[PDB]
Structure formats: C-alpha cells, structure tokens
C-alpha cells in the first residue's frame, strides 16, 4: 500500500518546481529530500505520495492543550506513515515518534547581514543594539528555552521577553528580516539552512562563529512502526555508498552564486 | 544485576591511569568513554563493570567462518551486555547488534609526518613512493573494501595487494609507524583519534585534507535487548544538556601539549 509522506516546503529540501502547475503528484516537487525519498522508496520497495504538512510547522507540543502540531503531529495522530524532512532528532520527539540514524549533521548557528559587529553567541548575549530571534516552532527555540548553560540561558531570558517579538514564522521570514534590518537583527538557525542561504543572491548574509551545538536530522516514523527498520538500514547504506554527500553538493554548492 | 561493559584501550576514550598498578576494578581506567559510562549508568541507574575486550579489536566478520570478533563478537555471543567505546555505526553491524543514536561524529582522515608532500586522498592514490594503510578489523578498512567511489577503490586495490602489509593491529602501531618512517608512511584513521594525537608530544604528525566520509559512534547492545531504550534516551539527554561537549573539550583540547 502507498506510503503517505509528510514533508515541508523549505529550500532547498523541498521546493515547488518552476512549472509546478502543469505537473501531477510527486512530479510537482524537487530538492534534497525529494531525491532522498525516491532513493529510500526504491531501496525499501514501496510506492509513496509526497504531502506538504498542512500548518507549515516542524512539530511542537502546545503546553496548554498538549496537542502536537506540525509534521510530528501528522505522525502522532495517524495522518502519515513517514516524514522525510529536515526534522531534528530530539529527546522529547524520540519519546513519541521513532527516528532513523541521522542522514545529515548540523548545529544551531548565527546568521548576520555582512558587516555586523558580531562574532559569536557570547557577543550577542552582552549587547542590546542588535536584536536576534529564532524560528517559532522548532528545536532551535526549544534548545534555548530548555538550556541550563550560561550564555544561552541569558539569551533566552532576553528573547522570550523581547518586543516586538524576535521569533518568526518561517525561515524566509527570518532571512528577509536579516536583509532589511541593516544589521540590527541576527537570526539563529541550523547551520545547513545558513550555509544554503549564504550561497544565494544577493549574497548579503553569512554564517559567523562556530555552531552552538551538534545534532542530526532523521527520517521519522510512528512509534513502533514496522517501516522504521527498513528505512534505518536504507539511510546507513546510502551514507556508506556516498549518496548523501553527492546530494548535499548538488543542492548546496553545485548551485553556488556567491 | 551488574552490567558487563566491554570496551577497548584507545586514547583518550579509555586509558590506564598513571598509577593503575595500585588501583582496582573501574578505578584503573580514565578517559572520555570512562566518564560517559559513569554518566550513562547514573541516569539509567545500573551498576557496571568495565572489561577490556579480550582480543583488542573493534569487530569484523571472518568471511570464511562467519564468526564476529572484537567488541562486536562480545555482544553477539553473550559475553557482554553493552559496549561503550569509539565503535562506528555501520550497516553490517546494525544487522546484528543495536546502536544508540551517535554520541560523537567523525570521518576517515589522513595522518602524515609533518612535511610529507601529501594534501589529499587523490594525492596518495596517484603515487607509490609513500605507502599507506589502516587498522585491522575495523570500519575504516571495510570502507575501502566496499568502495565504489573511483579514488578510494583504487586505494584499496593498492592496499590489499601491497607488501609487506600496510595494515596494523592497533592505533598506537599505526602512529608509531608514521613517526619512524621518515615520511614514507601515511596512516588512514578516524579524524577524532587523528586530532588527539596531533595535540600530543612529540608533536610530529598532522591531519591533512578533509574527512573522506562522515559517520558516528554509537553505544551498542545485543539485538533487541531492553537496555537499549534507556541508553538511547540517555545519550540524547546528555547531548542536549551539553555534557558530551564538556567531555570532548576536557579530554581533547584542555589536554593540548603542542
Ligand atoms: N566541545 C565542542 O566542540 C562544542 N561544539 C563544537 C561544534 C558543535 C558542538 O556542540
Ligand atoms: N542525532 C545526533 O545525536 C547527532 N549529533 C551530531 C554529531 C553527534 C551528535 O550526537
Ligand atoms: N546531504 C548530506 O546528508 C551529506 N552528509 C552529512 C553527513 C552524512 C552525509 O554523507
Ligand atoms: N560532499 C561531502 O561533504 C564529502 N565529505 C566532507 C565531510 C565528510 C563527507 O563525507
Ligand atoms: N550515525 C551516522 O550515520 C552519523 N553520520 C555523520 C554525520 C551524519 C552521518 O550520517
Ligand atoms: N564529546 C562529544 O561527543 C562532542 N560532540 C560531537 C558531536 C556531539 C557533541 O556535542
Ligand atoms: N529542524 C528544526 C526546525 C528549524 C529550527 O528549529 O531552527 C526542527 O526540526 O524543529
Ligand atoms: N572506530 C572503528 C575503528 C577505527 C578504524 O577502523 O579506523 C571501528 O569501530 O571499527
Ligand atoms: Zn507556485
Ligand atoms: Zn539507489
Ligand atoms: Zn547528568
């Protein structure tokens, strides 16, 4: 039976094709996670259907209602068989869904407009002129909200109370804010998305400093789903055959313009 | 019941304390994986005993006999309940044991004596003056055995037939051979161990070029044992709390001598 795959529109993992209107089904989409879903499906031996997640979120649990939103939600509540996306493996998510071993490494990083007087996280903590935020419902926001560590715990104190809000709805919103703010706003986001943007015109942003942490993206399935086993084996095989490295180069760098 | 942990002596993961002679049991050893074992046992609430793996190897399958040796063998045949060591998550191993999510990242790298006229794998591949090899019964050697990638496959074709053998029993032996070969031997080994050695006296070796792949170390349990769930969740918590980052600086860079 056809596997229903939940994913998210995030460049350059899944993107609308130039002529998306004149194509049907899986043919409408392109990018890193679209190529990877075909590979996974082929080595696992299953047919599938790409679906963009209705609310455009990665997944968080609403503290009052306790309902999970985003892709995690689609898995938790039985709307999807699998998620193939830049979804971060975390402890609170591993408690309700299953993840395959990481297919991509990454860490929280800092994006600035070129020329901003900022070199690190500790530089961001002890200053007020330059504002900074993160994406609204993901692992990046929760890392800061959950952190005991100094610089980060103080950064959270700041962001949660900042006005107007320093959080954004989408990555594009974060980046557009960076570009328009003449260096008066820095954006905290995963190193992978920071690196992609740095290679796109107008070439006016850049990643500074080392990463604040170190984690991975995994293919997620409903807790105890049988599919888990085959897809984990598939990711390891495809890393070992060099597939994942080829794909990153194709979509990040063989694409450069800066 | 007391947990039998199988491990390997490999700096700076597990090493003998200076005054080992006068100490007993777990107190004999120190290092990154020694601290990580305390931490895992603390959070999971089990008592444990560290045991250095009998044959001194990581684990590979004899193609004639089909018997697994090393730490992998200890788990496969029931000599041990858990393996806490720099054990590489691979596809043939995940078929017979379980791995936690990665506690540390790394790739195959190149170690040269300072001054050796080599920057990359492609370099090594196109010449015979400088010999090169890897550890026995580990994941690096098997990386080169199963390479379809153009450059690596040629390197293996060279290595397997090379003579006298370019392969070594242990890391120390590999590193001693670099140091004593006046630049006529390069050693292929994980970036992690490479970066450690580069920081220690006599300070005569170095990591050149970029990593040849990208993979992870995982905590290993016999297939479908109950321990695995707890330890997986523990690794993720420990990464999320920054402890894994504390440990790596403690053992790697706080230790610098060059
Ligand atoms: N101790 C560390 O290396 C800390 N950092 C470096 C990159 C990301 C990670 O958590
Ligand atoms: N899934 C993860 O835990 C991945 N990361 C990044 C490197 C090691 C760490 O645990
Ligand atoms: N596109 C990617 O997944 C590239 N990388 C990151 C580590 C595993 C893989 O080969
Ligand atoms: N295309 C790549 O990223 C290849 N490399 C670089 C880091 C390790 C990996 O396999
Ligand atoms: N456990 C792994 O497969 C780890 N590695 C290194 C970075 C991501 C990749 O797949
Ligand atoms: N000691 C460590 O494992 C340090 N690093 C590497 C990736 C995970 C972690 O934060
Ligand atoms: N990868 C993140 C989304 C982006 C972010 O939080 O910065 C997640 O899965 O929650
Ligand atoms: N970490 C490797 C051993 C080191 C190597 O093969 O270079 C393994 O688990 O087999
Ligand atoms: Zn459109
Ligand atoms: Zn394929
Ligand atoms: Zn602790």
Curated annotation (Swiss-Prot), chains A, B:
Sites marked Interaction with the cone snail toxin Con-ikot-ikot: 61, 145, 237
Tissues in which the protein is found: Detected in forebrain. Detected in dendrites of neuronal cells. Expressed in the pyramidal cell layers of CA1 and CA3 and in the granule cell layer of the dentate gyrus.
Annotated site location: Crucial to convey clamshell closure to channel opening: 118
Disulfide cysteine pairs (residue numbers): 203-258
Domain of life: Eukaryota
Post-translational modification comment from the UniProt entry: Palmitoylated. Depalmitoylated upon L-glutamate stimulation.
Protein induction: Down-regulated in the pyramidal cell layer of CA1 in the hippocampus by global ischemia.
Record's subcellular location: Cell membrane; Postsynaptic cell membrane; Postsynaptic density membrane
Residues holding L-glutamate: 86, 88, 93, 139-140, 190
Sequence ranges on the Extracellular membrane side: 117-258
Family from the record: Belongs to the glutamate-gated ion channel (TC 1.A.10.1) family. GRIA2 subfamily.
Further remark: The postsynaptic actions of L-glutamate are mediated by a variety of receptors that are named according to their selective agonists. This receptor binds AMPA (quisqualate) > L-glutamate > kainate.
Assembly description: Homotetramer or heterotetramer of pore-forming glutamate receptor subunits. Tetramers may be formed by the dimerization of dimers. May interact with MPP4. Forms a ternary complex with GRIP1 and CSPG4. Interacts with ATAD1 in an ATP-dependent manner. ATAD1-catalyzed ATP hydrolysis disrupts binding to ATAD1 and to GRIP1 and leads to AMPAR complex disassembly. Interacts with GRIP2. Interacts with GRIP1. Interacts with NSF via its C-terminus. Interacts with CACNG2, PICK1 and GRIP2. Interacts with GRIA1 and SYNDIG1. Part of a complex containing GRIA2, NSF and NAPA and/or NAPB.
Function: Ionotropic glutamate receptor that functions as a ligand-gated cation channel, gated by L-glutamate and glutamatergic agonists such as alpha-amino-3-hydroxy-5-methyl-4-isoxazolepropionic acid (AMPA), quisqualic acid, and kainic acid. L-glutamate acts as an excitatory neurotransmitter at many synapses in the central nervous system and plays an important role in fast excitatory synaptic transmission.
Swiss-Prot/TrEMBL domain comment: The M4 transmembrane segment mediates tetramerization and is required for cell surface expression.
Protein name: Glutamate receptor 2
Lineage, uppermost ranks: Eukaryota, Metazoa, Chordata, Craniata, Vertebrata
């Amino acid at each position: 039976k056809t596997v229903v795959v939940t994913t998210i529109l995030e460049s350059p993992y899944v993107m609308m094709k130039k002529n998306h209107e004149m194509l049907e089904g899986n043919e409408r989409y392109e990018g890193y996670c679209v190529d990877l879903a075909a590979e996974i499906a082929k080595h696992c031996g299953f047919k599938y259907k790409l679906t963009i997640v209705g609310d455009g979120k990665y997944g968080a649990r609403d503290a009052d209602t306790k309902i999970w939103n985003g892709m995690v939600g689609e898995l938790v509540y039985g709307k999807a068989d699998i998620a193939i996306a830049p979804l971060t493996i975390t402890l609170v998510r591993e408690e309700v869904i299953d993840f395959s071993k990481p297919f991509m490494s990454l860490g929280i990083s800092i994006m600035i407009k070129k020329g901003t007087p900022i070199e690190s996280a500790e530089d961001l903590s002890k200053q007020t002129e330059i504002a900074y935020g993160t994406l609204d419902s993901g692992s990046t926001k929760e890392f800061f909200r959950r952190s005991k560590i100094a610089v980060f715990d103080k950064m959270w104190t700041y962001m949660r109370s900042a006005e107007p809000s320093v959080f954004v709805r989408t990555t594009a919103e974060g980046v557009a804010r960076v570009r328009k703010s003449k260096g008066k706003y820095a954006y905290l986001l995963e190193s992978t998305m920071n690196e992609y943007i740095e290679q796109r015109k107008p070439c006016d942003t850049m990643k500074v400093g080392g990463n604040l942490d170190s984690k991975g993206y995994g293919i997620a399935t409903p807790k105890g789903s049988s599919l888990g086993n085959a897809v984990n084996l598939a990711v390891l095989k495809l890393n070992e055959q060099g597939l994942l490295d080829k794909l990153k180069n194709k979509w990040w760098y063989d694409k450069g313009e800066c």
